[PDB]
């Protein structure tokens, strides 16, 4: 299993009913976001603001692209976290019910398909 496969597997265990990551969504994730770039604190704060600003558009696109209604009262979860370099894109959202090492320095690039 790749890093991406394990993140997708873990995320699906906590997916809202009728909200699972689909085959299509998983392939788009693999294609659009195979390598991620660690964000600074400031870049993470701006990425969160961008999400608050775009999340209604991004939930409509989730509905239109997977052919499903957004599960009732579910919060949108980033599959690849923003802080890790996740995207504010419908294919990086999944609806949800609600150790030792220092974090990598900002600018670190990680290939998820290994």
């Amino acid at each position: 299993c790749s890093t991406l496969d394990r993140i997708i597997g873990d995320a699906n265990k906590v997916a809202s009913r009728g909200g699972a990551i689909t085959a299509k969504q998983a392939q788009i994730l693999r294609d659009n976001l195979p390598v991620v770039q660690r964000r600074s604190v400031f870049q993470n704060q701006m990425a969160r603001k961008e999400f608050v600003r775009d999340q209604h558009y991004l939930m409509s696109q989730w509905e239109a692209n997977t052919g499903r209604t957004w599960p009732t009262g579910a919060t949108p979860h980033h599959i690849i976290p923003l802080e890790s370099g996740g995207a504010n894109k419908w294919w990086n959202l999944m609806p949800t019910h609600g150790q030792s090492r220092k974090a990598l320095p900002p600018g670190t690039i990680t290939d998820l398909r290994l």
Partner: protein, 159 residues
């Protein structure tokens, strides 16, 4: 402070060329062998107990100066010098080997290139405004061919 002397020093430098060689630096330096042993699989023997205490030096333009929390508007001259030292360090860091910066799925080459440009921009601010010598110490390690990655009390963690 001689800015042109700094540009010719940057001009004739060999940045990152001595990464993982066991050279004598300041007694304040903790030398770790490679990116793996700093960032992916650290051990507190190689960190000499200080791992708990370490903060990575800035590796992005959006990060804060750990040494001086200068809120002041910079003189226009200084803005001009910072752009020129940045371009100087960008030209002295073309085509670095990726092998010494890569472990497994992790590529540290952008972090390192951002980090050295950050250190030189802040060094110029430091020397121009007479703020101290914290960045002078970090830049000395760069000039010796190493990568200072981290501050842990009065220690500098380096590859």
């Amino acid at each position: 402070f001689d800015f042109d002397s700094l540009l010719q020093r940057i001009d004739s430098s060999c940045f990152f060329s001595r990464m993982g060689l066991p050279d004598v630096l300041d007694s304040r330096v903790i030398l770790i062998e490679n990116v793996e042993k700093v960032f992916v699989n650290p051990t507190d023997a190689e960190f000499k107990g200080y791992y708990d205490s370490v903060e990575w030096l800035p590796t992005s333009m959006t990060q804060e100066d750990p040494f001086y929390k200068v809120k002041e508007v910079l003189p226009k001259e200084l803005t001009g010098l910072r752009i020129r030292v940045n371009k100087a360090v960008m030209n002295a860091t073309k085509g670095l080997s990726k092998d010494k910066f890569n472990y497994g799925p992790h590529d540290f080459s952008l972090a390192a290139r951002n980090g050295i440009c950050f250190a030189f921009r802040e060094y110029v601010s430091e020397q121009y405004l007479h703020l101290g010598n914290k960045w002078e110490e970090v830049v000395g390690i760069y000039f010796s061919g190493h990568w200072p990655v981290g501050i842990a009390k009065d220690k500098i963690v380096t590859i």
